[PDB]
Amino acid sequence: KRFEVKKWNAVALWAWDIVVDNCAICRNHIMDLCIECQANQASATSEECTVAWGVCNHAFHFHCISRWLKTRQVCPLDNREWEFQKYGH
Amino acid sequence: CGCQFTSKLEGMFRDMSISNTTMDEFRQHLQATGVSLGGVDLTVRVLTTGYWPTQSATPKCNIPPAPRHAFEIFRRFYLAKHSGRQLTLQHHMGSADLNATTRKHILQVSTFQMTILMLFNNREKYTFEE
Amino acid sequence: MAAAVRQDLAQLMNSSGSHKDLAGKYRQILEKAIQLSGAEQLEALKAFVEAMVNENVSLVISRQLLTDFCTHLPNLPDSTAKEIYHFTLEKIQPRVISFEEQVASIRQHLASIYEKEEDWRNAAQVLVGIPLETGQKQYNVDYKLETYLKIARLYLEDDDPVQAEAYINRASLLQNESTNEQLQIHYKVCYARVLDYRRKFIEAAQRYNELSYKTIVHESERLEALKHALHCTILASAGQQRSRMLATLFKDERCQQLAAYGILEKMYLDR
Ligand SMILES: [Zn+2]
Numbered sequence: 001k002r003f004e005v006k007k008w009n010a011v012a013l014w015a016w017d018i019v020v021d022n023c024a025i026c027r028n029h030i031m032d033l034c035i036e037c038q039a040n041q042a043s044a045t046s047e048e049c050t051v052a053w054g055v056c057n058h059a060f061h062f063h064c065i066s067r068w069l070k071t072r073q074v075c076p077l078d079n080r081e082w083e084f085q086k087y088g089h
Numbered sequence: 090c091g092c093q094f095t096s097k098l099e100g101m102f103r104d105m106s107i108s109n110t111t112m113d114e115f116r117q118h119l120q121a122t123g124v125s126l127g128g129v130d131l132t133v134r135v136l137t138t139g140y141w142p143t144q145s146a147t148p149k150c151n152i153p154p155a156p157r158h159a160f161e162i163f164r165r166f167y168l169a170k171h172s173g174r175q176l177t178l179q180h181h182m183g184s185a186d187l188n189a190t191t192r193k194h195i196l197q198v199s200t201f202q203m204t205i206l207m208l209f210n211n212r213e214k215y216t217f218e219e
Numbered sequence: 220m221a222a223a224v225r226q227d228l229a230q231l232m233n234s235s236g237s238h239k240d241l242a243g244k245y246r247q248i249l250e251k252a253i254q255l256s257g258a259e260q261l262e263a264l265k266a267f268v269e270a271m272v273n274e275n276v277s278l279v280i281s282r283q284l285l286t287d288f289c290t291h292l293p294n295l296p297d298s299t300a301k302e303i304y305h306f307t308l309e310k311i312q313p314r315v316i317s318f319e320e321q322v323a324s325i326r327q328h329l330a331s332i333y334e335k336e337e338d339w340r341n342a343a344q345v346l347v348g349i350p351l352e353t354g355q356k357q358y359n360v361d362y363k364l365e366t367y368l369k370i371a372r373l374y375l376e377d378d379d380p381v382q383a384e385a386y387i388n389r390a391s392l393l394q395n396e397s398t399n400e401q402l403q404i405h406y407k408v409c410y411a412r413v414l415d416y417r418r419k420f421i422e423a424a425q426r427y428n429e430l431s432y433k434t435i436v437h438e439s440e441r442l443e444a445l446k447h448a449l450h451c452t453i454l455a456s457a458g459q460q461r462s463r464m465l466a467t468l469f470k471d472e473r474c475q476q477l478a479a480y481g482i483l484e485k486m487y488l489d490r
Pocket residue numbers: 023024025026027028033034035060061064
């Protein structure tokens with residue numbers, strides 16, 4: 001051949017995916033509503049119960065983390081202050 | 090300045106340290122197992138999306154066959170001994186050293202012209218449509 | 220005459236010419252191999268697969284002829300063309316990143332054919348192998364939803380729903396992106412089933428009851444979904460949530476038509 005490649009320095013990005021698991025506050029799942037949505041409210045009409053992503057890349061139900069923010073505000077998996085970087089999956 | 094905006098930057102250069110340290114493990118695998126023509130000379134880099142933003146769109150162009158084997162080997166290794174995370178390939182990053190051939194002068198393509206030159210090697214006399 | 224076909228493929232690989240002429244000549248060779256039968260046809264098609272995956276052959280030449288090879292395959296009965304399905308699936312590996320549409324078609328065909336021979340075990344594993352996560356070939360949200368739904372349904376029939384939970388997981392991830400309502404209805408039925416299987420009888424009854432008051436679902440399927448809701452409610456944990464569902468199920472007149480109508484009637488009225 002006329003042109004042959006010898007060296008290559010590509011950058012391979014990695015991202016934690018399949019982040020399905022469990023909203024550890026509600027202990028039901030990362031999705032499929034929460035304890036405050038399958039045991040508390042019955043109507044569940046015009047409702048949401050999304051996910052809640054923080055700066056430390058942790059994931060919980062929006063309902064579960066918001067209620068947890070009443071007393072404590074320190075993201076019980078660490079001591080980070082848990083900024084709200086995203087909602088939903 | 091503070092934490093929130095600045096800590097993201099301090100993680101970018103930290104991931105640059107992550108890249109070479111991850112390659113230190115990769116280099117250890119290179120010392121143990123020899124690589125064939127698909128993998129003659131590779132220095133791949135591993136970064137985290139939590140600090141380094143996407144350039145424009147992370148495109149999905151094709152790959153030349155020799156880099157195809159090299160990326161396949163690295164992806165297979167990363168999915169075997171580093172399970173729990175899958176890699177995404179992109180073209181808007183990196184470089185290359187294209188050995189051309191009166192002497193043998195190695196060119197340089199920044200992972201943009203690799204696809205174009207590879208098609209030329211397969212067959213010359215192309216155009217914008219090709 | 221498989222050796223002659225292989226020799227023709229090898230000679231055509233080293234030939235130089237326009238892409239259209241090469242594609243036509245290869246297509247004629249493929250048609251001749253299809254006209255064969257028995258082991259001769261199997262070896263001829265195996266050589267055809269080997270030629271397509273060869274590096275020298277152009278990608279456009281490779282991608283379409285493999286697609287055309289795949290299209291003629293369902294015509295051949297359920298037999299010899301399946302050891303080549305495994306052969307072709309493993310063959311696509313150096314260029315598995317180049318194209319995944321043919322791999323997707325083969326896996327979908329293989330899963331359905333495995334589904335024919337009462338095999339939800341191997342059909343699941345084959346269809347798991349799909350790289351839906353990639354997104355390079357941006358599988359339309361329905362297709363990823365359809366594939367994830369099929370794996371979950373296959374994993375439901377043999378009942379190993381440790382992965383089916385993890386597959387109904389990624390199914391709902393893409394679910395709130397899709398458009399097709401019938402696919403959404405088919406999803407909610409499967410999701411309601413998944414709740415019924417694992418331990419979520421009370422949650423399955425809620426999902427079944429929500430799906431019971433639908434219009435596009437067949438009246439027989441609507442009655443069947445409600446019948447599952449009644450069965451799930453009876454089998455659910457006896458508590459406040461179950462009592463409310465029992466009260467709700469004591470309203471449908473199509474509950475009365477069911478044979479278990481007496482069962483919840485004694486249940487809710489207290490006995
Ligand atoms: Zn929760």
